Every structure is written in structure tokens, then in C-alpha cells.
Amino acid sequence: LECHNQQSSQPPTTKTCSGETNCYKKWWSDHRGTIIERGCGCPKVKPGVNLNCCRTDRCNN
DSSP, X not given: OEEEXXXXXXXXXXXXXXXXXXXXXXXXXXXXXXXXXXXXXXXXXXXXXXXXXEXXXXXXX
């Protein structure tokens, strides 16, 4: 499964995951900025932080 890797405002980078056939994206705004991060798997959705789980390729962008 090929999903994105870049975070925050990085370039369009992807990578193949092994065993894991899922990817998720998490982001959260700060004082005067926005932090973004993606990866494979599906963590727990915590309150205050944005997170999205999907099973689509590069779905975590």
C-alpha cells in the first residue's frame, strides 16, 4: 500500500507499507500555524486533534 509520508507542508512523497493496508492523516492548528502528519495504520481519534482513517492509497494526504 502506497501512501503519503510528507508532513505539515512537505512535498508529495509516498511510500509502500508492509503488512499494514491502511493509512491515516492527522492535523491540528496552533497559535499561528498548522501541524500536519500522515502515516500508515489507524490510531485512536483523540479530542482536540484532527485525524482521519482510510484504506485508500495516498488517502492520507
